[PDB]
Amino acid sequence: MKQYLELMQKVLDEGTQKNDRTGTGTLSIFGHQMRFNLQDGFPLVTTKRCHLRSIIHELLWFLQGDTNIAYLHENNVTIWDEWADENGDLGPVYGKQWRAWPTPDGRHIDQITTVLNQLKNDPDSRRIIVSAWNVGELDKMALAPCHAFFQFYVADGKLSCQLYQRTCDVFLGLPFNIASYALLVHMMAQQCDLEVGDFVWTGGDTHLYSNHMDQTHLQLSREPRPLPKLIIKRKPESIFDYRFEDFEIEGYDPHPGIKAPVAI
Amino acid sequence: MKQYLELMQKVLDEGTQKNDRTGTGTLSIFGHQMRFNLQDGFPLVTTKRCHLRSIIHELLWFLQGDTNIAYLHENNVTIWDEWADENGDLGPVYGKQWRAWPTPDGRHIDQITTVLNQLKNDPDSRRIIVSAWNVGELDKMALAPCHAFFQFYVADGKLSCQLYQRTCDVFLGLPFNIASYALLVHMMAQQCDLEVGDFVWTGGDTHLYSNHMDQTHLQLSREPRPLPKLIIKRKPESIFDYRFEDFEIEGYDPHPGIKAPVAI
């Protein structure tokens, strides 16, 4: 997508050479932001073939609040396998914080429900936020939240959402992230009888791994194509009652897929 | 400052008319980002006369972790008076979360110390973060955090920091925020023997109050002037040992001050 490709080029032109968790080197920049008007089409990268299957399952899984990969496994979604322990547990990751952020006084805060309550009763609120960054729970998580905090906004009948992604693998991870949140906005908007607005993506440490440079140049030589259209076949009674089959993508005509090799 | 003025103009040109906590109306946009290369000068607005006195005291106060306004009062800093209760308490605001985020297992997480430990031992870490957004503590705070989360980054010997400000009063509040964090970056950099890099400011609900429109037009007619220079007269043994007198501003030549009327 135009915005996605411009970021790739920016990292290439302005990124600084360093490293990561001490594995593969990277080219990185700090601080970036782009906007996707969801009215112009669902932001699924077209310069390389992407799929939404795993993304959809993962989102529904997040919304359910259970952090055990069973549901994901039952459905052949393996992106979390790498981090899961023998029992398939990942600790208090995303889902747990979204639906049951633990407090010292013994409560489990349902941030998703809170947000919907706000979008319904006080849409102009300036703190319609969901945070996965639970400082006292980080150590117990298999992985610290990458997409750690997001905020909603309503204006002229449209629902917008900004995401703060503290760390971002532009080539491999980012395509996943944009689609995931774009999907959430569509779902929330539907539940709130609102049109979809903008998805504002903000990143912190935004980088490209050195072993993805050829892949990036290849992708940059491809012209983006019209964005596909998301179709929601059903209107569930709540944000927690969506099913995989409710989503469909129309008009997705992407360039060939590009593999993402990763060191271990 | 160029970046600050461009934001004002953007809100004017693209902002949508609505309201706030149901008081004064506003013109607002959602999602914005700007960068200040601290090597080009300390980002203290020059198109209107600003002062750093309150800002400095408040920052040192935050760093100390005590959320009672006594210290601020002792020094004639009154910006928190409005929210303080009879005992001068504000609840678990910024300071408390920065230095002692409470966990359900009974610990108080020192995020500032954690960050310094990271900048010292693992500067390439992608999670050098401090968050004030403690979901289970919001209700107890006199005010939910506006500048709620920030992340540091190190590259080529320079320390950068990005701030996520969920809500922003462009005219009245923003000047304060930029200077405050710019100051923190300078202090952290000094403690870490690093040069100052960029301060990346990211906002969520970014607005101008309708009763600040004339003020905004006035300010927009003024040409920004060279940014002043921050001087740190002393090199403390830790981030917690700074004193008000350690900071000085050189070359600050601003246009006349502009009052910010506020409804109640």
Tokens (6 digits) for A21: 């968790």
Q: Within 13 Å, how many C-alpha atoms sit on residue B93's CB side?
A: 22
Nearest to B26 by CA among B161, B170, B209: B209
Q: Does residue A139 sit at the B interface (CB-CB below 8 Å)? A: no
> Min CA distance, B161 vs chain A (Å)?
8
Q: Which among B33, B127, B204 has CB closest to A166?
A: B127
Q: Do A204 and B151 touch (CB under 8 A)?
A: yes
Count of A-B CB contacts under 8 Å: 129
Residue B149 at interface with chain A, using a CB cutoff of 8 Å: yes
Q: Compare all CA atoms of chain A with the CA of B146 and give the residue at the minimum distance.
A: A127
B134 contacts on A by Cβ (under 8 Å): 135
Q: How far apart are CA A109 and CA A96, in angstroms?
A: 9
Contact B149 A151 (CB under 8 A): no
Chain B CB within 8 Å of residue A206 CB: no
Q: Is B198–A105 a contact, with Cβ atoms under 8 angstroms apart?
A: no
Say how many domains are in chain A: 1
CA distance A242 to A189: 13
Q: Resolution of this PDB entry, in A?
A: 2.0
Residue with tokens 């539940």: A191
For residue B10, the chain A residues in CB contact (below 8 A) are none
A243 burial (CB, 10 Å; 0-12 / 13-18 / 19+) is exposed
Pairing type for strands B195-209 and B158-169 reads parallel
- Output the CA angle B169-B170-B173, nearest 5 degrees: 55
The residue in chain B having the minimum alpha-carbon distance to the alpha carbon of residue A99 is B135
Looking at residue A223, what DSSP letter applies?
P
CATH assignment of the domain containing B257: 3.30.572.10
> With an 8 Å Cβ cutoff, is A124 touching chain B?
yes
Neighbours of B76 (CB within 10 A): 9
Sign, CA dihedral B201-A208-A129-B96, equals negative
Which parts of chain B fold into alpha helices (H)? 2-14, 53-64, 70-74, 94-100, 111-121, 174-191, 213-220
Strands of the sheet with A195-209, listed across from one edge: A16-18, A26-37, A195-209, A158-169, A147-155, A129-131
H/E segment holding residue A70? helix A70-74
Q: What is the dihedral of CA B53, B58, B63, B69, to 10 degrees?
A: 130
Catalytic hit among B146, B161, B168, B192: B146
Residue A237's CB: how many other CB atoms inside 10 A? 7
- To probe the interface with B, which of A27, A134, A135 has the most B CB atoms within 10 Å? A135
Contact B234, B27 (CB under 8 A): no
Which value, in Å, is the radius of gyration of the alpha carbons in chain A? 18
Helices (H), A75-204: 94-100, 111-121, 174-191
Distance CA B39, CA B198 (A): 8
Handedness of CA A54, A204, A32, A198 (dihedral sign): positive
Contacts B164 to A, Cβ<8 Å: 149, 164, 202
Q: How many angstroms separate the CA atoms of A261 and A211, rounded?
A: 7
Q: How far apart are CA A81 and CA A160, in angstroms?
A: 32
B264: which 2 tokens?
């109640």
Q: DSSP assignment of A6-24, as one string?
A: HHHHHHHHH-EEE-SSSSS
B105 touches chain A (CB under 8 A): yes
Q: Which amino acid type is present at position B99? A: R
Contact A35 B33 (CB under 8 A): no
CB contact under 8 Å between B30 and A204, yes or no, is no
Which of B42, B261, B58 shows the shortest CA–CA distance to B171?
B261
Residue among A28, A131, A153 minimizing CB distance to B30 = A153
Distance from CA of A156 to the nearest CA of B (A): 8
Structure tokens that stand for A115 in this block: 């947000």
Q: Which domain holds residue A116?
A: 2-264
Q: After which residues is chain A broken (C to N over 2.5 A)?
A: none
> Cβ contact (<8 Å) for B30 and A149?
no
CB–CB contact A103 B104 (8 Å): yes
* Rounded Cα–Cα distance for residues B124 and A262 (Å): 19
Q: Across-strand partners of A160?
A: A153
Parallel, antiparallel or unpaired: strands A229-232 and A129-131: unpaired
- φ, ψ at B235 (rounded to 5°): -120, 95
* A97 alpha-carbon distance from chain centroid: 15
- Can A146 be counted among the known catalytic residues? yes
- Cβ-Cβ contacts under 8 Å, B136 against chain A: 101-105, 107, 109
